[PDB]
Amino acid sequence: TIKEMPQPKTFGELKNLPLLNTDKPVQALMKIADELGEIFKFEAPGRVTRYLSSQRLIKEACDESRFDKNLSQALKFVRDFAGDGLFTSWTHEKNWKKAHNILLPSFSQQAMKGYHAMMVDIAVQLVQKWERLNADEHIEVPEDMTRLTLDTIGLCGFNYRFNSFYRDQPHPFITSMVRALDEAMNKLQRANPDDPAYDENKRQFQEDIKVMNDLVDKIIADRKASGEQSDDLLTHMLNGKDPETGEPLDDENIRYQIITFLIAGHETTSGLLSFALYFLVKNPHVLQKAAEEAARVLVDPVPSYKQVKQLKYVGMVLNEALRLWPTAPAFSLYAKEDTVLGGEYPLEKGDELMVLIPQLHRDKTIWGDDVEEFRPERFENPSAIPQHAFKPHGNGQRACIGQQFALHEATLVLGMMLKHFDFEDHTNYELDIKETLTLKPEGFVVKAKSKKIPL
Ligand code: HEM
Ligand SMILES: CCCCCCCN1CCC[C@H]1C(=O)N[C@@H](Cc1ccccc1)C(=O)O
Ligand SMILES: C=Cc1ccccc1
């Protein structure tokens, strides 16, 4: 029962590459999936991949005995500054499992309890900023959630204060990081990337990587000269020992991990909080239920670790926001051996797949007809959700190491947000999703009305 898989429109020798010549390539790929179905072939000069959109097929793709993590072209470009850090290393490179073993303890329960106070530090700065707005001023939502999430990973992970709420413009790190991600995304469709027409792109890229590495240098220098005993993510990078190889990370890999965790440790969480607030103001009944939980649980001026763990409906709000708009919207796999997908699509060892997460999460055979609705109650019982239907944090041993960090931060922050403010979608905002490999609302603004509850 070997099927012929569909393929979107081609452009001669450029094959499908020009379909990526858009500012919104993930959303263009979702529209193609809408048209072609659960699997389609996508070719570029010298490369083939297959985009999967159905839980039927993706549940097989998530079999780690058959498929391993692949570096997509996007991750190969990001590797230019993230190196063999955890996000952009191959599973078989020695530094992947070594850094995984050394850094996994930085995301244990005990580690999260130790991060909690500094998460509150930044969260209180956010609440205070909004309490201090004048009447009819508004909140620039993705901008403020980036301030919050960047500052949280800086402080909790590295004892470094980006002081984003003291800035009306983005921290230089953010400016260069966004420009580097923009460049990597635009480079995806460049048929001749070495054409001198991109000399300036290349120079700018190098400049943005330097800016990013200069901050890394400062973070490292401050820690090794410090007279305060820390026990954070950076402590583990500098001192942790891999039980298997027995070795600590070397200096070159440490710098890659710092870059990796500064970027991965905030960008996707700012997208999540932005989408979550968007869906909450667009679904006032859901907002009310979540606000009622926040009021009942957050009975102290400062939330505790234990209280955040009881914000269970807020947790489902965030999972439902990750369902509709997972902020790292795809991951890539390669076949470890010859194998057949879904009884219909034979693959050879080395063949590549892309998992198109926002389309997987719209599989009507899993979620039902109401798939576009924002209904956090879908997550009331994980046992009622089929295997591999919900993959916003990737798969298997290569799943997101920071998942608990992200969800604790986002649960804490959204809980305080709902405890302290009413929110108004005063412009009737039309969702506009900006792509920088990752996904985030653009131009999303709201008004907040203080409940005047002291901190
Ligand atoms: C809601 C926020 C987040 C989302 C949606 C998310 C999503 C993902 C996804 C899908 C992957 C797999 C990528 C692939 O297979 O190519 C991944 C990997 C990773 N994420 Fe996250 N992430 C989030 C937050 C974080 C945070 C806060 C950190 C750091 C504190 C983090 C650190 C990482 C790292 C290090 C990896 C690579 C893991 C490995 O392969 O060993 N992420 N994330
Ligand atoms: C950084 C965390 C999010 C990463 C998401 C990456 C996911 N891409 C973000 C933008 C679009 C999407 C994607 O489909 N990319 C493919 C594109 C591609 C396929 C075949 C040949 C050439 C290029 C790729 O990068 O290989
Ligand atoms: C370098 C890794 C990364 C991770 C998430 C978003 C952008 C970049």
The values of phi and psi at residue 27, to 5°, are -65, -35
Pocket of ligand 2 (CB under 6 A): 20, 25-26, 29, 42, 44, 47, 49, 72-74, 78, 185, 188, 328-330, 354, 437-438
Does residue 351 contact residue 69 with C-beta atoms inside 8 Å?
Answer: no
Please spell the DSSP secondary structure of 388-401, one letter per residue: TS--TT--GGGS-T
What does DSSP assign to residue 376?
G
Nearest Cα residue to atom 5 of ligand 3: 264
Q: Which amino acid is at 257?
A: Q
SS3 69: strand
400 is in an annotated binding site: yes
Does residue 144 contact residue 168 with C-beta atoms inside 8 Å?
Answer: no
Bridge partners of residue 50, in order along the sequence: 41, 353
In angstroms, rounded to a whole number, what is the distance separating the alpha carbons of residues 391 and 55?
10
Nearest Cα residue to atom 1 of ligand 3: 260
Please spell the DSSP secondary structure of 120-141, one letter per residue: HHHHHHHHHHHHTPPTT--EEH
Using a 6 Å cutoff on CB, does residue 274 contact ligand 1?
no
Phi/psi class of residue 283: alpha, beta or left (left: φ > 0; alpha: ψ in -120 to 50)? beta
Name the closest ligand to CA 107: 1
Using a 6 Å cutoff on CB, does residue 260 contact ligand 3?
yes
SS3 330: strand
Strands (E) across 15-111 are located at 39-44, 47-52, 67-70
Does residue 233 contact residue 99 with C-beta atoms inside 8 Å?
Answer: no
Rounded to the nearest 10°, the torsion over CA 403, 409, 410, 416 is: 160
Using a 6 Å cutoff on CB, does residue 394 contact ligand 1?
yes
The values of phi and psi at residue 421, to 5°, are -140, 145
Could you report how far apart the first and last alpha carbons of the chain are, in Å? 64
What does DSSP assign to residue 191?
S
In angstroms, rounded to a whole number, what is the distance separating the alpha carbons of residues 435 and 267?
12
Nearest Cα residue to atom 6 of ligand 1: 393
Cβ neighbours for 446, distance < 8 A, ≥ 6 positions apart = 138, 139, 141, 277, 281, 423, 424, 425, 426, 429
| Rounded distance from Cα 203 to ligand 1 centre (Å) | 28
- Half-sphere CA count of 276, side-chain side, radius 13 A: 27
Ligand 1 atom nearest 398 alpha carbon: 40
In angstroms, rounded to a whole number, what is the distance separating the alpha carbons of residues 95 and 91?
9
The values of phi and psi at residue 296, to 5°, are -70, -35
Locate 349 and state its tokens.
């060892």
Locate 162 and state its tokens.
């980006």
Q: Which amino acid is at 325?
A: W
Strands (E) across 400-452 are located at 421-424, 433-436, 438-441, 445-450
In angstroms, rounded to a whole number, what is the distance separating the alpha carbons of residues 130 and 133?
5
> Could you give the residue ranges of the DSSP H alpha helices within 227-283?
233-239, 251-264, 267-281
Using a 6 Å cutoff on CB, does residue 393 contact ligand 1?
yes
Using a 6 Å cutoff on CB, does residue 87 contact ligand 3?
yes
Locate 134 and state its tokens.
């004048």
In angstroms, rounded to a whole number, what is the distance separating the alpha carbons of residues 190 and 21?
8
Does residue 363 contact residue 378 with C-beta atoms inside 8 Å?
Answer: no
Does residue 416 contact residue 311 with C-beta atoms inside 8 Å?
Answer: no
In angstroms, rounded to a whole number, what is the distance separating the alpha carbons of residues 236 and 231?
7
Strands (E) across 31-114 are located at 39-44, 47-52, 67-70
Ligand 2 atom nearest 51 alpha carbon: 14
Cβ neighbours for 288, distance < 8 A, ≥ 6 positions apart = none
Query: Which is it for strands 438-441 and 433-436: parallel, antiparallel or unpaired?
Result: antiparallel
Does residue 136 contact residue 260 with C-beta atoms inside 8 Å?
Answer: no
The residue whose two tokens read 């947000």 is 417
Using a 6 Å cutoff on CB, does residue 271 contact ligand 1?
no
Going by C-alpha positions, the residue among 118, 167, 176 that lies closest to residue 143 is 167
Using a 6 Å cutoff on CB, does residue 256 contact ligand 1?
no
The residue whose two tokens read 């763990």 is 309
In angstroms, rounded to a whole number, what is the distance separating the alpha carbons of residues 183 and 72?
15
Using a 6 Å cutoff on CB, does residue 33 contact ligand 3?
no
Measured in angstroms, the resolution is: 1.5
In angstroms, rounded to a whole number, what is the distance separating the alpha carbons of residues 156 and 160?
8
The residue whose two tokens read 């795809």 is 330
| Rounded distance from Cα 139 to ligand 2 centre (Å) | 31
- What separation in angstroms does the CA of 395 have from each of 36, 60, 76, 84, 398? 25, 12, 19, 19, 6
Does residue 256 contact residue 83 with C-beta atoms inside 8 Å?
Answer: yes
| Rounded distance from Cα 165 to ligand 3 centre (Å) | 23
Does residue 451 contact residue 422 with C-beta atoms inside 8 Å?
Answer: yes
Does residue 446 contact residue 423 with C-beta atoms inside 8 Å?
Answer: yes
62 is in an annotated binding site: no
Bridge partners of residue 39, in order along the sequence: 52
Under CATH, what is the fold of the domain 3-455? Answer: Cytochrome p450 (1.10.630)
Does residue 129 contact residue 144 with C-beta atoms inside 8 Å?
Answer: yes
Number of Cβ within 10 Å of residue 22's Cβ equals 15
Angle between helices 267-281 and 251-264 (to 10 degrees): 10
Number of Cβ within 10 Å of residue 161's Cβ equals 13
Using a 6 Å cutoff on CB, does residue 254 contact ligand 1?
no
Q: Which amino acid is at 297?
A: V
**Residues in the chain, overall count:** 455
Using a 6 Å cutoff on CB, does residue 405 contact ligand 1?
yes
Name the closest ligand to CA 180: 3
In angstroms, rounded to a whole number, what is the distance separating the alpha carbons of residues 39 and 354?
10
Burial status of residue 116 (CB atoms within 10 A of its CB: 0-12, 13-18, 19 or more): buried
In angstroms, rounded to a whole number, what is the distance separating the alpha carbons of residues 434 and 22?
11
> Could you give the residue ranges of the DSSP H alpha helices within 132-266?
141-158, 172-187, 199-224, 233-239, 251-264
| Rounded distance from Cα 74 to ligand 2 centre (Å) | 5
Locate 20 and state its tokens.
């990526």
DSSP helix, strand, coil percent of the chain (3-state; round to 5): 55, 10, 35
Ligand 2 atom nearest 438 alpha carbon: 3
Name the closest ligand to CA 408: 1
Ligand 2 atom nearest 44 alpha carbon: 21
Q: Which amino acid is at 60?
A: E
